[PDB]
Amino acid sequence: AKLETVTLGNIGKDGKQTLVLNPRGVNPTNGVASLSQAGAVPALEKRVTVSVSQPSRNRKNYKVQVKIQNPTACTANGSCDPSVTRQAYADVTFSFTQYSTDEERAFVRTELAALLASPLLIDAIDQLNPAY
Amino acid sequence: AKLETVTLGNIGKDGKQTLVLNPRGVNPTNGVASLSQAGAVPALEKRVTVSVSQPSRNRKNYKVQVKIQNPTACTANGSCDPSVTRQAYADVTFSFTQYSTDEERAFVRTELAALLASPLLIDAIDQLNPAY
Amino acid sequence: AKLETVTLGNIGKDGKQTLVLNPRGVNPTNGVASLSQAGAVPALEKRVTVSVSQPSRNRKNYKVQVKIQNPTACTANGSCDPSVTRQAYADVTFSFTQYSTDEERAFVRTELAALLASPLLIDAIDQLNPAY
Amino acid sequence: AKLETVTLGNIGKDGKQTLVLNPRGVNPTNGVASLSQAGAVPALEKRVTVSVSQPSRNRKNYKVQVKIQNPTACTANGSCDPSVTRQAYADVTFSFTQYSTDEERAFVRTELAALLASPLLIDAIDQLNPAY
Amino acid sequence: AKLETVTLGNIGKDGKQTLVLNPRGVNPTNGVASLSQAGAVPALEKRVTVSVSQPSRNRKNYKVQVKIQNPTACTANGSCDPSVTRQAYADVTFSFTQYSTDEERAFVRTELAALLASPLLIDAIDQLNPAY
Amino acid sequence: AKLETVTLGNIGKDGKQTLVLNPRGVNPTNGVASLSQAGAVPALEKRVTVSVSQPSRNRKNYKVQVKIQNPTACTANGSCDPSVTRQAYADVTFSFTQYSTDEERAFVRTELAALLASPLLIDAIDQLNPAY
């Protein structure tokens, strides 16, 4: 996953928007990759970062974690710089056995995408209805 | 949200498998739909569970939570022992406030579908080649 | 009361408005039904929910409770998303004996509607005058 | 509010009964009108009481409270014993702030009159068939 | 397993009666679902109650249960409630180990319904006559 | 009243299979009518046993006890003689008072068969789907 700029799309309710994730770098002090759209004023921007966690003396498994930050930045007309008055997010953790293969890990990755793209979760997220 | 049979296509590293979930009833303590996999034993494998919390606690926010359970077998016995041994799994939480826009929630959802289609996230999971 | 969408009307001071209550679902963790108009941004919306309480080892009777939420959502022109700066409500509890019949329960239900629709309460609610 | 004789028509499961209340005086401790039912003994049955609180406590809000008392008899004795035994009742509170709009208060009131006319609330009370 | 309205038929001594079971939801502290009868008075109802339990450690097995059914109502010399005595009861549970087949489960369910219909039990139960 | 061979058709998931119980006399330990499946191995696996008792001094209630056993044997890798690994069964009882008669017994056993055949129990048992 050697970082490179990737444009993501089919975004939003209609699946029409795109976003661009430009690597900013990888933070060596915590094992976290970071890419963003824009970035002139980071507080106001959408960001995606990924942690890397390997098996260890105190870790039974390894992880890939994606942190998704989606702020809403507002200012009233007549004023200056906007500020974030909402922070929307997602927190995606993948966790796997050291004896697991690519196909099995991929099932979890693609099951997630296929299911989040399915009505059960589309409604759980857009309508926020109780499972029912 | 509303539960109905879910068919998930284009699954796995090849993008060729199909999974079928059966959301047949919601847990009274956790608000969790049991998305059983099709097949009496396979149902326990590749199982997913889903709950949508309400802003009923002093956080004043809510979370849509999907838990993906993918334990797998290693060589079942003639005694009808499934030999389930190893496991892959994921925890994905969304992680919004009460004033959030449905469109923004949709972006977060579709952005993840897009991230799961990108080498920046895929290589780190299927080939376990992290960001750099 | 198998939930279905119902339009309510003769609403407001003149008895002219209507509202639509679309089931969102029933929360199995607390026995509470929920329906609303709209819902894209739940904090800002009118909602009606109903609890169900049955006789028990620690309950002498059974109840039907209706919770009515009527927020006032405001933003100033030139800004963004409105927020609620008023929460108006009603809390309606019905409670009955296990030996009571439908007619008796209906008397309480229709007595309430007939009386809330009568000047004694119309003025108690719109004018907020002391009983006098 | 202002008290005068109240006639409530279209009462009961059939919508055919008429009740008559007599709001003849307000309780000095609770601010409660005694809406006596017509008839010296029937007055005690199907009795309703009403009070409008003022924002005189550190809540800075107020409540219109109506209490419906519908105890009923089972087979009076020749000794002139009314045999009142079983009871149906309701407590309805409105539950507004000092800055509320009269129109919004009217909506809450009329919305309840409308809810009491809907199967979503009726079936749960008259047939005791709750939401689902 | 959505606990929606259930209609039964072809029942009673001559197989000619019908019954609609109207669910009232599930007890939050007891996994058993309950379904209401057509009677107006709760104290007189013959409620159907149902549960599916799926244990892990402590039992490592599965259980499904239904509770049946009715107290007998009557009056004599004047009353208050036409009161009921439990007279007609049955209790059916299903039990099996983990990882069972759906066909195995189906046979136990269908075998019982067939056994109940069969003369050896349908007449033996009516008469309470041991089969020898 | 009499012991007889039982043929049960239209059973199993598809409602098409037939099971046959060969009579096996009486067990005078408990007054149990023992019947078992008509085959060399089913004789060892699959069986139904039944007893009926009048009230004991500790009941004032008649009892019917039906035990349905449908275990599955598996052949371990090294066995010649397969044995039961999955002991599936059902526990079926009835209880009636000393003043109950034919209709009380009839609606219970016929309502039970109707319940077993209902879509709620078909799904609750065959799939093990909780009624939520």
Structural account:
Chains A, B, C, D, E, F: Keywords: Capsid protein, RNA-binding, T=3 icosahedral capsid protein, Translation regulation, Virion. The structure is cut from a larger assembly and holds 6 copies of chain A (132 residues). Chain A has a single domain (1-131), classed as MS2 Viral Coat Protein (2-Layer Sandwich), CATH 3.30.380.10. In chain A, 17% of the residues lie in helices and 42% in strands. Chain A is built from 2 helices and 6 strands, in the order ββββββαα. In chain A, strands 1-2-3-4-5-6 form a 6-stranded antiparallel sheet, with helices on one face. Chain A starts with 5 loop residues before the first strand and ends in a 6-residue tail after the last helix. Chains E and F meet through β1, β2, β4, β5 and β6 of E and β1, β2, β4, β5 and β8 of F. β6 (83-96) of chain C pairs antiparallel with β6 (84-97) of chain D.
Proportion in helices of chain A: 10-25%
The amount of beta strand of chain A, in percent, is 35-45%
CATH topology of chain A: MS2 Viral Coat Protein
**Which sequence of strands runs across the widest sheet of chain A?**
1-2-3-4-5-6
Tell me the CATH superfamily of chain A: MS2 Viral Coat Protein
- Counting DSSP H or I runs of 4 or more residues, the number of helices of chain A is 2
Structural domain count of chain A:
1
Rg of chain A from C-alpha positions? 18 Å
Number of strands of chain A: 6
Multimer state: part of a larger assembly
Query: How far is it from the N-terminal to the C-terminal residue of chain A, by CA?
Result: 39 Å
CATH architecture of chain A: 2-Layer Sandwich
Summing up helix and strand content along with how strands pair, one would put the structural category of chain A as: alpha+beta
Biggest sheet statistics of chain A: 6 strands, antiparallel
- Using a beta-carbon cutoff below 8 angstroms, give the protein chain pair with the largest interface and the number of residues from each chain: E-F, 79 and 77 residues
Shape of chain A, please?
Answer: globular
Which class of chain A in CATH terms?
Alpha Beta
Family (chains A, B, C, D, E, F): Belongs to the Leviviricetes capsid protein family.
Keywords (chains A, B, C, D, E, F): Capsid protein, RNA-binding, T=3 icosahedral capsid protein, Translation regulation, Virion
Subcellular location (chains A, B, C, D, E, F): Virion
GO molecular function, one term (chains A, B, C, D, E, F): translation repressor activity
